[model samples]
Target: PDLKKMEQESIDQLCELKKLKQFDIQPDGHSLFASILDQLKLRHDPKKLDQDMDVMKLRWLSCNYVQEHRDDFIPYLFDMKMKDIDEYTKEMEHTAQWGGEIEILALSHVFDCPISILMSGRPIQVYNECGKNPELKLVYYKHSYGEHYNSLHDS
Candidate 1:
């Protein structure tokens, strides 16, 4: 009746179903659920299971944070390079829906830092914006990443 026991029982049922109907598993409504059961089977111990869940939660948190700040975040230059903003806008609209609930969080420091080093350019700016939270810092980045100078230049 506990959460873990419930999950364990669900997994066992899926495995039993898979064994009973090996070929039918793919077409059944429980196919995806069965696949999840297969993954759960790979975890050798509770620590590994906890670690996997932690990683998944971290991904979800960062993605949600990025989605909440999409307007503030700089757009990728590739999409912006086009002359017709309409085309880009349409593509973005499609992507916004297709990207689903998963937010794409770029760890700018790791890749952007090295690119700046080679180009002799300014460091990458990292902004952490907690929406509608007045107590939190609105816009700021680490000194190593770059200073927010409030540039007037337009793309």
Candidate 2:
């Protein structure tokens, strides 16, 4: 019984970070949005990042795509093509881990498509059409709440 708890964490940089119920904003509330645009500009080259990226965001999961064509997957495992199975499965067993989800923006710039967020209060959050540098954008649509993870994102 000789340990002490640490409370409060300070951010190294609070420019454009986004998280659930968390914000680093200024008077107008557009600061974070403005910050994000700058970040999109900052990270365009080299595709630099503070974090590697969320494994989940790098992957796309679809119950509809898999189920509508039961011929591809074995059931709830390895949602890929038959011949393409081995190429990703054995590798997946090692990487198919979410432990869960959170934030990592720089990762978004590396992709051609904008990110998407499937939210409870919203039908969908589509991150399409980022500006000049064409980094990434996020959009949200209205939806009634459902299960814990009726929501998801992708690069």
Candidate 3:
């Protein structure tokens, strides 16, 4: 099949999937599935497989192939919801109570709460609620320069 024709058929199937309500567990679940289909439309293309293989080779050369860019290349494994807050919170609490250190408590709270605040687009209240840890500072950096280069080159 021609690339454009195959692309259109995939898009039409996606639209049909979007209209499907019976298969979904919840309304939001349908939306989430639709978003996943959109990701597929954006990423997957049979014709580009050869080019993608070449890029993958270059990525492997830059670092350990299985560890580096595993998140992008192995989407099915990486694309799952994180463990719920109850499990995470319990783990954190246990760590702190087991003579690990009180600093672990603060660090866990900071790590989880920042993700929540960012996702919700709400202001973080660590200052007023926790009375400010003066030692705390946000640090940001990325180690996957090769991954970035590959993504940009492919696009």
Candidate 4:
């Protein structure tokens, strides 16, 4: 009885963490995936887009990049198993893993851009601060699932 009770409690916590809802400020995952350029049209050149930078490739590279820079990832991703790049990539294909510092770090490096994240409770965070690539700004929020981010534009 005690074991089952403990198991149920753990399951509840997992369920709570998985609970997510849509908000006006943040785009849904699929929408964000499909309309990345639309979101960036304010400052991005659409013609230069490449399939090598298409969805799967971009996600795959983020994993490899993170794994190679495992030392830098320790403080942010200490709880996640960073030993296998493949597993890390596979796990990230869905929403279970909420992107945060580690993701922004790899993304900024991959795109060769400086990224700034504006959050409500904390000072803005900039990744790849020394890069020459055009900076991308995003807003960070603490949602039901975990950390969430959305692009920022004057419009």
Task: Give each model a TM-score.
Answer: 0.20, 0.22, 0.17, 0.61
Off by over 4 Å in 4: 1-42, 51-56, 79-87, 93-96, 143-145
TM-score for predicted model 4 compared with the true structure: 0.61
List the candidate numbers ranked by lDDT, top first: 4, 2, 1, 3
Report backbone clashes per prediction.
Answer: 0, 2, 0, 0
Model 4 agreement with the true structure over 1-155: per-residue lDDT tens digits: 45545543543443344352222344344322222322334345557445345544555656678777877666664453544544665687644355456566786787677777655445667889976667766655444234545545542
The local distance difference test score of each candidate is 0.27, 0.31, 0.26, 0.53
* Predicted structure with the largest lDDT when compared to the true one: 4
lDDT of 1 by residue, 12-43 (tens): 35435434212222323222222222323332
Cα error, residue 34 of model 1, in Å, equals: 26
Ranking by TM-score: 4, 2, 1, 3
C-alpha lDDT (0 to 100) for residue 12 of candidate 1: 38
Candidate 3, residue 12: lDDT: 37
Candidate 2 lDDT, tens digit per residue, 30-84? 2223334334444445455434433333333222223334454443333343335
Cα RMSD of predicted structure 4? 10.1
Backbone clash pairs for candidate 1 read none
What are the C-alpha RMSDs, in order, of all predicted structures? Answer: 21.3, 15.7, 19.9, 10.1
* Two-way lDDT contest, 2 vs 4, winner: 4
**C-alpha displacement of 99 in model 4, angstroms?**
1.7
Candidate 3 TM-score to native: 0.17
- Return the number of clashes found in candidate 2: 2
